[PDB]
Design an enzyme around this catalytic site. Sequence first.
Site, short mmCIF file in Angstrom:
data_model
loop_
_atom_site.label_atom_id
_atom_site.label_comp_id
_atom_site.label_asym_id
_atom_site.label_seq_id
_atom_site.Cartn_x
_atom_site.Cartn_y
_atom_site.Cartn_z
N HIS A 31 0.84 -1.18 0.00
CA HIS A 31 0.00 0.00 0.00
C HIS A 31 0.89 1.25 0.00
CE1 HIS A 31 -4.13 1.61 0.53
NE2 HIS A 31 -3.47 2.65 1.01
N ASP B 100 -7.99 -5.42 -0.21
CA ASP B 100 -8.47 -6.31 -1.24
C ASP B 100 -8.04 -7.75 -1.09
OD1 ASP B 100 -9.64 -4.14 -2.67
OD2 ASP B 100 -7.51 -3.63 -3.20
#
Lengths: 366, 367
Positions: free
Chosen positions: A256, A311
């Site tokens: 991320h 996700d």
Amino acid sequence: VVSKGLENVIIKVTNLTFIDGEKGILRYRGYNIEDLVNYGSYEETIYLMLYGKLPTKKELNDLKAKLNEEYEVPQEVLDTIYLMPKEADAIGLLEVGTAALASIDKNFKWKENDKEKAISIIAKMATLVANVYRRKEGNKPRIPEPSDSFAKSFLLASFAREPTTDEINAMDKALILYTDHEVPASTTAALVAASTLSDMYSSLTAALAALKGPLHGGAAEEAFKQFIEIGDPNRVQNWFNDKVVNQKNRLMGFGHRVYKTYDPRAKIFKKLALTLIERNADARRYFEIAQKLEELGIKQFSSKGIYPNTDFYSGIVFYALGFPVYMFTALFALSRTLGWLAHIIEYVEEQHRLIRPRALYVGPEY
Amino acid sequence: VVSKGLENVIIKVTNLTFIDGEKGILRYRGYNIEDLVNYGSYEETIYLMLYGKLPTKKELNDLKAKLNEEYEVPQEVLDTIYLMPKEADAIGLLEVGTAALASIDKNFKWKENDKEKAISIIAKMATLVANVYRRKEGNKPRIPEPSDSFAKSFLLASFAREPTTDEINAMDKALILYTDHEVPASTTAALVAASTLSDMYSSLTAALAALKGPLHGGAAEEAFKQFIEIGDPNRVQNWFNDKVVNQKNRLMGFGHRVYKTYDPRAKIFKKLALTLIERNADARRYFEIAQKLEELGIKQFSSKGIYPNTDFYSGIVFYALGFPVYMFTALFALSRTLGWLAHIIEYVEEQHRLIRPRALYVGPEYQ
């Protein structure tokens, strides 16, 4: 000289969402997400986002009554969706549906009653997503009916089966977890539409237009597709050693550009997967696969600050409620619809400026 | 810290359009507008914008053929357009039509055949625009047939009346003139969509959604509306003296962000209107209001660097060709579709970056 991707450009101030990537904290107007999921529901999160404060019992009741009054959509909006090919991309069908709404809503006026308007759009977003699914599965339309909650009405309308408590909860937390995060291209394009004073359906259309692209939509799908490719929990180690370790690829659903620690919503999504895997055997097969991967990934990458993001597990949850892999982005879009509408209202209502960037002419003048 | 409106931000570099706002110079790929409206067609401008140079005589003929093979649109798109209210805004109906096409087109891949794909889109936009018009007037749908030009094709589809040289010429020059200009909200929204690699029909949907706001679309309609308010040329001075002089109203069709001289394409737009008002007695009446209003306006604001812009005359050409006021922004969209495709194509093939701006979080630390 081009400011590439707008990366270092601030498009707006926001009172809406705050992310602390060092700590792994996500807040919506100051409230941690964990408090919202632990004590609240999607409805109370809608109220917060749009109106700024936690609602009273009577204030929440009133929102819930507006939502119950707004699921219906003109028949023409369902007919158009059903004229498109069954094989069409879910986000593409959402596009058509929202563009149609735009066009039917003649006589909309910015700043008259924006918040109520948004509430009616959320209710209608549920109706299109439900029917986008139904239409690709060959079924006749079904319109959400009034119920004790928005997760329940949506699930009722989708599957036509009485959802279990755990299912209502999974879908309700799901909705809150994806409400807002950063300003990706879907929010940017919504903001761009809204700065010309376009209607809210048109900004959602533009937001949906950007979300259809593979560099924005498909995150959950791609992550989830890894597990299918593995097939069996017994093949995780060989798969990981090969792909990750010595072929040096990415672990989709890991890493991320803000989080340096576990993503706060990945923690909550995993927990919801545990609550629904008992009922779907495929869902349980992928959770064991996914859970073996995560241990291998954390040993491998946590030292470089790379953690499971939202996700990695949201697909297992969606899959576990009965939605096919082709609807993950559209379920994201259902949820993100709240964030987008809040950004748009916020933009136009407190800090309005039309958006007209510049291009630099290069190549010959004559 | 915030870049309000993204005003001084360079979103991209470009070889497509060059503007000089002091000298009033508008060029496309180095070529002046004057040379293209004077000598070539809209088709030649399609070729230049997309392929980067002027077409050899057969290069232009193949493109032409390509256009001609691509007007047909699946009946579902037209049914969709005919399912919406006839009173819907026209940009709205376009949005629906481009979204319908985006979801029917499951076989698209950036960087395979962008140029050919953009050519196929330009032709379907003519069909869209023609049929949004028919549906708002209540007529049955009509698809453009192959012809010697795209302007001819479009007018035939629209009216189902054979156009004349002057007409075909005015439509065709209109198209070249509105092809590109700056990076407004519509192009920007097209770039943002294309930055994620969404399809071309979807990027157009994005541009069209932004175009619909009253702060982007509706310009030509606001200029022309003033003339209709006047009604007859004998009231110009009173209205001018009334609304503008003492009541300090904003003359519409005048003023520019970049041009502090008269808009180059306004200059050509006026000429085109002279060319067709004989035929239209209603046009000439409006053209006479316009020409007298420009006179007083220029007298009033030239010193401020406020001269007639391109939206002051365009409405009259469109009105003279037979289009109602409500088609105006749509006519612009038809024209500017070219600019949109060339911009996203230029962006994806050479400067590709995904757009992720920042928001600065002010707001409660922890409630």
